[PDB]
Amino acid sequence: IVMTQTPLSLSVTPGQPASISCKSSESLRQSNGKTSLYWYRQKPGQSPQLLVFEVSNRFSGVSDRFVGSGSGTDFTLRISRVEAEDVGFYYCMQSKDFPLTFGGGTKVD
Amino acid sequence: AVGIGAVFLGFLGAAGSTMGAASMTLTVQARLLLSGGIKQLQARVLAVERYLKDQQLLGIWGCSGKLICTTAVPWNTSWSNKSYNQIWNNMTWMEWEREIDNYTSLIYTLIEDSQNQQEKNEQELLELD
Amino acid sequence: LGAAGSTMGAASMTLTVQARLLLSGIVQQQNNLLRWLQARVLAVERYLKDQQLLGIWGCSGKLICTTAVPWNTSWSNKSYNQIWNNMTWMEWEREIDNYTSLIYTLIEDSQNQQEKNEQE
Amino acid sequence: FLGAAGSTMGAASMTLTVQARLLLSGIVQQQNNLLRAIEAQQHLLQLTVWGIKQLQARVLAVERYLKDQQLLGIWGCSGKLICTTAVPWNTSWSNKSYNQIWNNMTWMEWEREIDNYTSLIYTLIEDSQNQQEKNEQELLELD
Amino acid sequence: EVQLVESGGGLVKPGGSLRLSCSASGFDFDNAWMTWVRQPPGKGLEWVGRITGPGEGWSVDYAAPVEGRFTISRLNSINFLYLEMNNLRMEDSGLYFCARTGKYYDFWSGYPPGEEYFQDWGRGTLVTV
Amino acid sequence: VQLVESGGGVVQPGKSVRLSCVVSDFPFSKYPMYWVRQAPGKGLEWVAAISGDAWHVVYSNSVQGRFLVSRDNVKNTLYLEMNSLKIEDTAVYRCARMFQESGPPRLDRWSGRNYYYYSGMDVWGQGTTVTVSS
Amino acid sequence: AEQLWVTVYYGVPVWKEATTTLFCASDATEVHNVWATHACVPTDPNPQEVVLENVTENFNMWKNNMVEQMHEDIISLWDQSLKPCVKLTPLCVTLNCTDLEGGEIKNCSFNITTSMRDKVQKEYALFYKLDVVPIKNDNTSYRLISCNTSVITQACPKVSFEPIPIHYCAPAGFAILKCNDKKFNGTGPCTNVSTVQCTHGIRPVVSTQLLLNGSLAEEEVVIRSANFTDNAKIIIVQLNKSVEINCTRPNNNTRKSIHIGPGRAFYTTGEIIGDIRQAHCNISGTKWNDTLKQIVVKLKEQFGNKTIVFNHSDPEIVMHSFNCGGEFFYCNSTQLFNSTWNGTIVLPCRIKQIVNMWQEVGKAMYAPPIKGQIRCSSNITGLILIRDGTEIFRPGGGDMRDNWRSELYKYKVVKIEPLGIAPTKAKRRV
Ligand SMILES: *[C@@H]1O[C@H](CO[C@@H]2O[C@@H](C)[C@@H](O)[C@@H](O)[C@@H]2O)[C@@H](O[C@@H]2O[C@H](CO)[C@@H](O[C@@H]3O[C@H](CO[C@H]4O[C@H](CO)[C@@H](O)[C@H](O)[C@@H]4O)[C@@H](O)[C@H](O[C@H]4O[C@H](CO)[C@@H](O[C@@H]5O[C@H](CO)[C@@H](O)[C@H](O)[C@H]5NC(C)=O)[C@H](O)[C@@H]4O[C@@H]4O[C@H](CO)[C@@H](O[C@@H]5O[C@H](CO)[C@H](O)[C@H](O)[C@H]5O)[C@H](O)[C@H]4NC(C)=O)[C@@H]3O)[C@H](O)[C@H]2NC(C)=O)[C@H](O)[C@H]1NC(C)=O
Ligand SMILES: *[C@@H]1O[C@H](CO[C@@H]2O[C@@H](C)[C@@H](O)[C@@H](O)[C@@H]2O)[C@@H](O[C@@H]2O[C@H](CO)[C@@H](O[C@@H]3O[C@H](CO[C@H]4O[C@H](CO[C@@H]5O[C@H](CO)[C@@H](O[C@@H]6O[C@H](CO)[C@H](O)[C@H](O)[C@H]6O)[C@H](O)[C@H]5NC(C)=O)[C@@H](O)[C@H](O)[C@@H]4O)[C@@H](O)[C@H](O[C@H]4O[C@H](CO)[C@@H](O)[C@H](O)[C@@H]4O)[C@@H]3O)[C@H](O)[C@H]2NC(C)=O)[C@H](O)[C@H]1NC(C)=O
Ligand SMILES: *[C@@H]1O[C@H](CO)[C@@H](O[C@@H]2O[C@H](CO)[C@@H](O[C@@H]3O[C@H](CO)[C@@H](O)[C@H](O)[C@@H]3O)[C@H](O)[C@H]2NC(C)=O)[C@H](O)[C@H]1NC(C)=O
Ligand SMILES: *[C@@H]1O[C@H](CO)[C@@H](O[C@@H]2O[C@H](CO)[C@@H](O)[C@H](O)[C@H]2NC(C)=O)[C@H](O)[C@H]1NC(C)=O
Ligand SMILES: *[C@@H]1O[C@H](CO)[C@@H](O[C@@H]2O[C@H](CO)[C@@H](O)[C@H](O)[C@H]2NC(C)=O)[C@H](O)[C@H]1NC(C)=O
Ligand SMILES: *[C@@H]1O[C@H](CO)[C@@H](O[C@@H]2O[C@H](CO)[C@@H](O)[C@H](O)[C@H]2NC(C)=O)[C@H](O)[C@H]1NC(C)=O
Ligand SMILES: *[C@@H]1O[C@H](CO)[C@@H](O[C@@H]2O[C@H](CO)[C@@H](O)[C@H](O)[C@H]2NC(C)=O)[C@H](O)[C@H]1NC(C)=O
Ligand SMILES: *[C@@H]1O[C@H](CO)[C@@H](O[C@@H]2O[C@H](CO)[C@@H](O)[C@H](O)[C@H]2NC(C)=O)[C@H](O)[C@H]1NC(C)=O
Ligand SMILES: *[C@@H]1O[C@H](CO)[C@@H](O[C@@H]2O[C@H](CO)[C@@H](O)[C@H](O)[C@H]2NC(C)=O)[C@H](O)[C@H]1NC(C)=O
Ligand SMILES: *[C@@H]1O[C@H](CO)[C@@H](O[C@@H]2O[C@H](CO)[C@@H](O)[C@H](O)[C@H]2NC(C)=O)[C@H](O)[C@H]1NC(C)=O
Ligand SMILES: *[C@@H]1O[C@H](CO[C@@H]2O[C@H](CO)[C@@H](O)[C@H](O)[C@H]2NC(C)=O)[C@@H](O)[C@H](O)[C@H]1NC(C)=O
Ligand SMILES: *[C@@H]1O[C@H](CO[C@@H]2O[C@@H](C)[C@@H](O)[C@@H](O)[C@@H]2O)[C@@H](O)[C@H](O)[C@H]1NC(C)=O
Ligand SMILES: *[C@@H]1O[C@H](CO)[C@@H](O)[C@H](O)[C@H]1NC(C)=O
Ligand SMILES: *[C@@H]1O[C@H](CO)[C@@H](O)[C@H](O)[C@H]1NC(C)=O
Ligand SMILES: *[C@@H]1O[C@H](CO)[C@@H](O)[C@H](O)[C@H]1NC(C)=O
Ligand SMILES: *[C@@H]1O[C@H](CO)[C@@H](O)[C@H](O)[C@H]1NC(C)=O
Ligand SMILES: *[C@@H]1O[C@H](CO)[C@@H](O)[C@H](O)[C@H]1NC(C)=O
Ligand SMILES: *[C@@H]1O[C@H](CO)[C@@H](O)[C@H](O)[C@H]1NC(C)=O
Ligand SMILES: *[C@@H]1O[C@H](CO)[C@@H](O)[C@H](O)[C@H]1NC(C)=O
Ligand SMILES: *[C@@H]1O[C@H](CO)[C@@H](O)[C@H](O)[C@H]1NC(C)=O
Ligand SMILES: *[C@@H]1O[C@H](CO)[C@@H](O)[C@H](O)[C@H]1NC(C)=O
Ligand SMILES: *[C@@H]1O[C@H](CO)[C@@H](O)[C@H](O)[C@H]1NC(C)=O
């Protein structure tokens, strides 16, 4: 399947909310009752770290201002009051079936 | 995000195979025969009322709870001109139940009243000693 | 119902006919579904009550089976040929109807709950 | 009948000599009096909300009884309570030792231990034994 | 490597019932004779009863003050020993032990049925009546 | 926990090496693993996956048939062997654990076929790097 | 070692959690009651309750399916018994009302009734201020309240309204577990979990701001809710020491009939006899005062400072509401919410004859008048309270589903699955 995203560059400063959406060609809803889309972040020069696993739940060591939602095709990750250390990339990763692909990784300065 | 190939067998999976290969497969067609806006309920009784009948006929024949069993009713060669090893190695079941379709009523009467009725009056009177 | 006037040693030869036609009788309803089944479902439940009950009584499949339970003459002390070659089945049921459920626990326990403790 | 749900598996087999505490006997002493024909002394007087629900209640009393008899019926274990099989236990299913399963364990926790593996055991009884023994029995009648 | 763990002991009113269990490991439970022994408080060891093996028909023998009330049984499939106690009295209370039982008979000086000895014991489980 | 690799470096085309990822503390036979490939200045490419019982192996289409993966649940190791190397395989390899736990295979009743569930990743090893050149 | 073999045990004591469909059991006749519905399986006075030994089982009193199941069913029972009756569509006409405290009951005179086509019929009628609305275009001239709201449908007068206890029995093979901890929070685990086959009596009482005929918490006064420091999750006050109330309709209220449906007669107030005396209630002033202090002690174990304040909570949702003998009372309960903690109490009551639904949209039932004088007494055992965030407590709104959460708070539904396997040394000889 194909799954890209937008916008590639968001060169910002801290103090404002924004959002990053990832757009799906094949719709995602597995028969377990959940939509296997995994949002996470790398830093430059680093192996990445999990932001949220599901579009609903979060991970340990995560600020509360990291909210995500979406339909089976629309998918959206929203960052309220974008923090100063939000540099690097943001990959949208799906887990429908194989080969499970990624997005390009939205750069945020 | 799942998936592996076949392991044991499938539902109706032996229905193009021979008898000698389908005889080791009967449980999969045996399990799923029962489990699976009123018109669901009218299905949920016919699926029961067909199961009891096939259960009942095995009960009368002294053959309840077993998947296979034998009797003492002799096979009559008038029923089949097929040779023996053609049956157990070449013919499928779906073909086989078009060939003995006509004789089926004669068979079922000649199991009960022939033998398993007779194997109780003989059975009850093996006492007194 | 043909041997309903026979003695208890005589009506036993028609036990097969009574059992077969308990379920659905002859099949009515000749596929005429053209144009509302609780009575159909109950008849199966009457049937499955008894086959399970013969399953607990160690006596599935058979029609006549023995036991290890001796009789208790306080039920009815009427002796062997006083009834057997003298009485039908409607009257024997009208001698044991008060004691019916009392017989059923004793057949359950001392014949299969007993013989479960002989398996080893 | 759930009187030993806190007891252990090595001890609950003691009280299981009563017919699973007369398990099925509670059904026949129910459906003798569920089939009180006051339902037929009224024809329910109408079709009511309760009789819709009773109809959907008796079906589940029919079906889920049959799914437990059929599986006991196919396993060569029709009507018994404690039967052994020919299937070897695989240690990959549970690496618990002997006494911990019996002497030192409940039942419902042991369900969640092998609720994953349960379905594989179902096929590995039939196609391993009860499909299999019937052919080998029929060979022993060929002679 | 023999291990025996008694269980099931607890507080019970006079006249009540109770069921002690014993999980056996480390040896051949199946053909092993098993024995129940108790220790009343401030008193010594007391022989309760013993179940034999296959050759003896799983026969069981009982101490006089306990004969008729207590029942010893085994399920060899999971190597468990049991003690069914009914109609308990104050003096039924103590610490209950289970122990692997050996048979001894010297030919030239022996007298039938020789003697039984207790090679392996468990820690016991406390019965309070 | 601790999650690194070994055996990285630089080789020629047509060569063959095998890495070695080693886990630290979690029960390794319980979990499946993965392989991912971040090209320098590009996004990420999924590579491979093994089941927890080392029975199910799914490869990417581009590296299909060339590579090799395996497990050793006793030694708690994780191998990525590779064959028929090309210059565009020069990137960063990373060893990575599944986020969730996985169960045993499922065996649907209606068809005798097992099922190994596969979900995504949480713990990326920092990973080695293989370069294919002259 | 011994090669272990598989052994099938039938009758293992296991279960899971499940959902199901239930069925009534009435413990007792012409069958014309809305709730009781004597077309129902009769009970058994067998004591069937089986206690367990070692059980730790979490419950819940909000995410339990047994209470959502009633609210999709008791509205179905109450609407099957409403469909075959007469509609009141020609009644929504222009009224002409006058009065004979002030003028409350209204001598109204609407003047058509289409039993036929050519000859429409003038008509006498007697109404209430809780049922009529004014019109703005002329002199005093009224209309019913819910014309443009929904179809006003009369209930047939030969029905009944009494609560009769409805024993929910699970179907066969299922079971209902029941805890017996006196100090149970409503959502934790339990220790003594007993097993029954069919629950206790549940009176299907409909009321608002209180509970009538209830049940009894034992030995003390229990307060339960989920999210305490949220204002949202309503606290529920169950009681011991059943507080008695009398409520009455001190009038005579003869009824006439009006033929509007061709074979379907409309019933209204013919004429009152005696003196126009307002319906009210009586509460023992001593027991009520003693009861509220017992609540505050348990309140001060979850709000143990900033002391407890009672303040009273649109004619419908603010008023206390209940039924009395097939007659619906709206009572001003302002007096019982006055105090804080640092003879015969009379509460006035109003009478409305156009009730609404639970979702209160799409249907509007009209009560028929009842001849004679109505007396009813009942044990007040249940109180609904809401916090606001010193602490002030209002009674609360009208979410009728919360009634039965005070009556199913010990019950979950399981699935007995008595088949299971275990390994042992014994092999079947082939
Ligand atoms: C039967 O099968 C089912 C599945 O199949 C089902 O049934 C079939 C029939 C089918 O129908 C199928 O469709 C069904 O689904 C099996 O169920 C599975 O069970 C397992 C449990 O055995 C579940 O795994 C858990 O899942 C959670 C997340 O799942 C949530 O959501 C699901 C669904 O949404 C829920 O069901 C579930 O309950 C949860 O709510 C997962 O997060 C868990 O992993 C964490 O916990 C374990 C335990 O600690 C960790 O393991 C430890 O790891 C350390 C590290 O190496 C080792 O040292 C330890 O030895 C090891 N073990 C133990 C016991 O401790 C695990 O690593 C992870 O730990 C967290 O790790 C992160 C990252 O390191 C860490 O975060 C860090 O935090 C710090 C501080 O904040 C820093 O910030 C770091 O930077 C940061 O990274 C975090 O703190 C760690 N937390 C802890 C507590 O350690 C757990 O695996 C599984 O979800 C479930 N379902 C499925 C589909 O698989 C069932 O098991 C089968 N039955 C049997 C008997 O096998
Ligand atoms: C108790 O249960 C056990 C587990 O049950 C399992 O789980 C249950 C939940 C349920 O699903 C079960 O169905 C399931 O089985 C039972 O254990 C199973 O037993 C069977 C035997 O009947 C096993 O079947 C064998 O499978 C082997 C593997 O087949 C896979 O791999 C083949 C290729 O093999 C691969 O080769 C490459 C070569 O490079 C290896 O890579 C190397 O790996 C190294 C180590 O990591 C190193 O890293 C190197 O760098 C690397 O190159 C790779 O590791 C290797 N794969 C594996 C898994 O090792 C494929 O061709 C094949 O398609 C499949 O993908 C077979 O080799 C084997 O055949 C051999 O053995 C026969 C008998 O021994 C012999 O006659 C043959 O001639 C042949 O030599 C079997 O087919 C099965 O794997 C077991 N399950 C598991 C999970 O392991 C157990 O049986 C049961 N108990 C009882 C008493 O029955
Ligand atoms: C309000 O609650 C009280 C107490 O909870 C109820 O009193 C109890 O009512 C029941 C039946 O109404 C009584 O049972 C009956 O007792 C009489 C005694 O003579 C006996 O003859 C009957 O056969 C039956 O067993 C119960 O005894 C009684 N409790 C006491 C202490 O007297 C009261 O009925 C409730 N009233 C309302 C309107 O809810
Ligand atoms: C479908 O039919 C084919 C033949 O038409 C079966 O193949 C035979 O399988 C047996 C079993 O090993 C072999 O001995 C024969 O040599 C096979 N035939 C040929 C021509 O090679 C096949 O088994 C059938 N399918 C099933 C499920 O039984
Ligand atoms: C409503 O009823 C009143 C009462 O009868 C009607 O008012 C009467 O009108 C007649 C006609 O002129 C007078 O003779 C009476 O004196 C009036 N009585 C009163 C009390 O006002 C009135 O017409 C009716 N209709 C409406 C629309 O108000
Ligand atoms: C209420 O208003 C009605 C008017 O509809 C009054 O009914 C009239 O009563 C007199 C006798 O008192 C009759 O002669 C008239 O024919 C009636 N008019 C009607 C029925 O339209 C009635 O008196 C008023 N008062 C009460 C207490 O009912
Ligand atoms: C029922 O409620 C009453 C009223 O509160 C309880 O009686 C009082 O309980 C408190 C708290 O234990 C004591 O301080 C009082 O001394 C009790 N008596 C009086 C007269 O107020 C009673 O305990 C509750 N339970 C039962 C079973 O009656
Ligand atoms: C009970 O409700 C209160 C709200 O009054 C909860 O407290 C806050 O809830 C919000 C909701 O997300 C959180 O963002 C805050 O962090 C919470 N504050 C504190 C101090 O915890 C409280 O969490 C609720 N408790 C439960 C068990 O639901
Ligand atoms: C409410 O009405 C009931 C009548 O049902 C009153 O109960 C009577 O109370 C007197 C005491 O004044 C007793 O002597 C009678 O035996 C009671 N009779 C009955 C039938 O209960 C009750 O007093 C009234 N008031 C309150 C506050 O409950
Ligand atoms: C309940 O009754 C009380 C009686 O005091 C009402 O309170 C006051 O009633 C007088 C009428 O004499 C009004 O002028 C006041 O404005 C009322 N006070 C308040 C604070 O509103 C009260 O209105 C009644 N409430 C209901 C819902 O019937
Ligand atoms: C768990 O509950 C049981 C219930 O025992 C019943 O208690 C009521 C109290 O009024 C009494 O009237 C009954 O006769 C009792 N017996 C039966 C069979 O209903 C208690 O006996 C346990 O002690 C409780 N467990 C704990 C830990 O409190
Ligand atoms: C079994 O009972 C345990 C108490 O005794 C323990 O048993 C053995 C197996 C050892 O683990 C030893 O630590 C103790 O003597 C409980 O701790 C345990 O939770 C119970 N349940 C199990 C093992 O499933
Ligand atoms: C019925 O009565 C006749 C004469 O009384 C008798 O000969 C016959 O055998 C009876 N029927 C049976 C079944 O005994
Ligand atoms: C059954 O026999 C016993 C003696 O063994 C006797 O005590 C009992 O009264 C008899 N049963 C009945 C119902 O009389
Ligand atoms: C059978 O019973 C009847 C009943 O009166 C009696 O007349 C007849 O003599 C009996 N016959 C025998 C053989 O006992
Ligand atoms: C829990 O079960 C064990 C095992 O029989 C028993 O000792 C104990 O008394 C039980 N718990 C309670 C509270 O009775
Ligand atoms: C109803 O009242 C109006 C108002 O005066 C009048 O015009 C009309 O004729 C009346 N109709 C009948 C049928 O009384
Ligand atoms: C209409 O009747 C009402 C009721 O008395 C009165 O208040 C109003 O003044 C009347 N209209 C006129 C124009 O007099
Ligand atoms: C009730 O008690 C349990 C612990 O026994 C606790 O976890 C739970 O939160 C309590 N209930 C409430 C509503 O706080
Ligand atoms: C209610 O109380 C008042 C005075 O307190 C009294 O006049 C009236 O009769 C009482 N009514 C009832 C039904 O108790
Ligand atoms: C009020 O808070 C203080 C602070 O802990 C506490 O000591 C006191 O008991 C509280 N008051 C009540 C009535 O609980
Ligand atoms: C009750 O609530 C009203 C609402 O405005 C408020 O004004 C009043 O102060 C509160 N307290 C009392 C005692 O009325």
Question: CB–CB of G24/G426 below 8 Å?
Answer: no
Nearest chain F Cα distance for residue D92, angstroms: 10
Of G167, G124, D123, G274, which Cα lies nearest the Cα of B25?
A: D123
Indicate the DSSP class of residue G429: P
Nearest C-alpha in G relative to E27: G1
What residues line ligand 11, using a CB cutoff of 6 Å? G 180, 191-192
**For the packed helices D49-74 and B43-60, what is the interaxial angle rounded to 10 degrees?**
40
Q: Please give the full DSSP string across G170-214, using - where no structure is assigned.
A: PPTTEEEEEE--TT--SSS--S-EEEESB--------EESEEES-
Helix axes D25-34, C38-56, angle to 10 degrees: 150
Check CB contact of E90 with chain G, cutoff 8 Å: no
Contact (Cβ atoms closer than 8 angstroms) between residue G88 and residue G154: yes
d(CA G92, ligand 19 centre) in Å: 54
Dmax of chain E from CA atoms? 50
CB G41 within 8 A of CB G195: no
Contact F120, F99 (CB under 8 A): yes
**G127 alpha carbon – ligand 5 mean position (Å):** 18
Single-letter amino acid code for the residue at F60: S
- Tracing tokens 């399963």 back to the chain, one arrives at D101
Q: What are phi and psi of D85, to 5 degrees?
A: -125, -170
- Phi, psi dihedral angles at E89 (to 5 degrees): -125, 170
Classify strands G419-424 and A107-108 as parallel, antiparallel or unpaired.
unpaired
CA-G332 nearest atom, ligand 10: 28
Q: Using CA coordinates, name the residue in chain A closest to F99.
A: A53
The answer to whether the Cβ–Cβ distance between B68 and D132 falls below 8 Å is no
Which atom of ligand 14 is found nearest the CA of C99?
Answer: 13
Q: In the numeric block, which tokens belong to residue C92?
A: 């024997």
Strands A18-24, A3-6: parallel, antiparallel or unpaired by DSSP?
Answer: antiparallel
G139, G140, G141, G142: residue to mutate for ligand 18 pocket, most atoms within 8 A of CB? G139
Q: Quote the CA–CA distance of E116 and G333 in Å, as a whole number.
A: 84
Chain B nearest CA to C6, separation (Å): 18
Secondary structure string (H, E, C) spanning chain D: CCCCCCCCHHHHHHHCCCCCCCCCHHHHHHHHHHCCCCCCCCCCCCCCHHHHHHHHHHHHHHHHHHHHHHHHHHCCCCCCCEEEEEEECCCCCCCCCHHHHHCCCCCHHHHHHHCCCHHHHHHHHHHHHHCHHHHHHHHCCCC
How far apart (Å, rounded) are the C-alpha atoms in residues G18 and G14?
A: 13
Instruction: Report residue G402: phi and psi, to 5°.
Output: -70, -15
Q: Give whole-number Cα distances, G414 to G14, G18, G64, G173, in Å.
A: 10, 5, 12, 9
Tell which residue, B72, B62, B58, B60, has the closest CA to residue B26: B58
Distance from CA of C50 to the nearest CA of D (A): 9
Give the other-Cβ count within 10 Å of D22's Cβ.
18
For E46, E85, E91, E129, the CA distances from E14, given in Å and listed in that order, are: 20, 11, 10, 6
**How many of the other CB atoms lie within 10 Å of CB of G290?**
12
Ligand 14, atom 13: closest residue by C-alpha: C74
Sign of the dihedral defined by the CA atoms of residues G62, G66, G67, G69, in that order: positive
Q: Which residues contact G320 (CB under 8 A, 6 or more apart)?
A: G207, G208, G209, G210, G330, G331, G332, G333, G347, G395
Chain B residues close to A97, C-beta within 8 Å: 1
Distance CA C95, CA F99 (A): 73
Give me the phi and psi of E72, to 5 degrees please: -105, 130
Angstroms from G393 CA to nearest CA on chain E: 48
**E strands of F3-90, at which residues?**
3-4, 9-11, 21-23, 33-38, 45-50, 57-59, 68-72, 77-81
Query: What does this entry list as its resolution, in Å?
Result: 5.0
Q: How many residues does chain E have?
A: 129
Q: B26 near D131, Cβ under 8 Å?
A: yes
Chain F: residue nearest A96 by CA? F119
Residues from chain D that touch F113, judged by Cβ atoms under 8 A, are: none
Residue owning tokens 């299999």? D132
DSSP, collapsed to helix, strand or coil, labels residue G101 as coil
Q: How far apart are the first and last CA of chain B?
A: 70
Amino acid at F31: Y
CA distance G423 to D10: 12
A47 touches chain F (CB under 8 A): yes
Q: Give Cα F81 distance to the centre of its chain.
A: 10
G332 in contact with ligand 5, CB cutoff 6 A = no
Residues sharing a CB contact under 8 Å with residue G277, sequence separation 6 or more, in sequence order: G250, G251
Q: Could you tell me how many helices (H) and strands (E) chain A has, helices first?
A: 0, 9
Cα separation, A28 vs A95, whole angstroms? 9
For residue E21, give how far its alpha carbon lies from the nearest alpha carbon of chain D (Å).
6
Alpha carbon E96 to its chain's center: 8
Q: Is any ligand 14 atom within 6 A of the Cβ of residue C74?
A: yes
What's the G168 CA to ligand 16 centre distance in angstroms? 31
- The closest-lying atom of ligand 19 relative to the alpha carbon of residue G187 is 11
CA-CA-CA-CA torsion sign (B60, B65, B71, B76) = positive
Atom 7 (ligand 5): residue with closest C-alpha?
G96
Q: Give yes or no for residue D94 CB within 6 A of ligand 16.
A: no
Q: How many CB atoms lie within 10 A of CB F89?
A: 20
Inter-chain residue contact A99 with F46, CB threshold 8 Å: yes
- β partners of residue G196: G176
Nearest to G140 by CA among G132, G150, G151, G130: G132
D·F CB contacts under 8 A: 10
Please name the residue that has the structure tokens 């002259």: F134
Dist CA G328 CA D133 (whole Å): 73
CB atoms within 10 A of CB G362: 10
Q: How many helices (H) and strands (E) does chain F have?
A: 0, 12
At residue D124, φ and ψ (nearest 5 deg) are -80, 10
Q: Would the CB of D6 count as within 6 Å of ligand 16?
A: yes
Q: Name the one residue in this structure whose structure tokens are 């309070």.
A: E128
CB contact under 8 A, D10 and E78: yes
Q: H or E stretch including G321?
A: strand G320-323
Assess whether the C-beta atom of G353 lies below 6 angstroms from ligand 6: no
Q: Provide the sign of the torsion angle of the four alpha carbons G67, G73, G79, G81, taken in this order.
A: negative
Chains contacting D (3 or more CB pairs within 8 Å): B, C, E, F, G
- Of G116, G122, G119, G98, which is closest to residue G108 (Cα–Cα)? G98
β pairing state of F129-132 and B6-10: unpaired
Does E3 contact D99 at a Cβ distance shorter than 8 Å?
A: yes
* Peptide bond preceding G348 in cis form (omega within 30 of 0): no
How far, in Å, from the CA of G346 to the mean position of ligand 10? Answer: 15
Cα distance between residue G309 and residue G296, in whole Å: 9
Q: Which ligand is nearest to the CA of C1?
A: 13
List chains adjacent to chain B, taking adjacency as at least 3 C-beta pairs closer than 8 Å.
A, C, D, F
Protein residues whose CB sits closer than 6 Å to any atom of ligand 20: G 246, 248, 282, 344, 346
